[PDB]
Point group: C3
Chain length 71, copies 3
């Protein structure tokens, strides 16, 4: 079960890097919203939020995988 745990941790690490990237983009677009809260900008922000939530669920999947292995 050694390969399993460490392989999932590496994927979990990559998944986390992806989350931080999307969050960076989410904070960049949030500053646009401030300068001028248009309605098309709001649309774009919503899309990235769903991407973040997608990435988040994906991370939690890998986490659950690792918890199975640990048990």
């Amino acid at each position: 079960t050694k390969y399993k745990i460490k392989e999932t941790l590496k994927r979990l690490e990559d998944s986390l890097r992806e989350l931080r990237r999307i969050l960076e983009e989410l904070k960049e677009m949030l500053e646009r919203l401030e300068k001028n809260p248009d309605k098309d900008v709001i649309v774009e922000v919503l899309k990235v939020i769903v991407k973040a939530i997608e990435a988040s669920v994906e991370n939690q999947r890998i986490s659950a995988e690792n918890q199975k292995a640990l048990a």
Copy 2:
């Protein structure tokens, strides 16, 4: 350890619910792209908070289970 197995099963069910909400969320996302107007935006925000609430609940169950593995 019975609790661990039980929590994993619970953690598993929470995940399935997340994907269901995620699909729902992904549907409505291409329903404001057709009608970029107000209160359809509100419909999505409702589902986003729902997704997040489900996400936090999933993380609560997850940490609870990690306290057990220790």
Copy 3:
């Protein structure tokens, strides 16, 4: 001790997350009252902090899993 301390960090991070969620939950009810423009923006900003809080909790959770391994 890693495990014990990481688990404590996880507890605090989770608390932080649940708190922001309570705020987000209230902001949503305010939106069911009067959808506005400033109101909507106010909800998006809270949603981002929640995601930030969630990513932070997931990072701390991963470290707790590292220790367990």
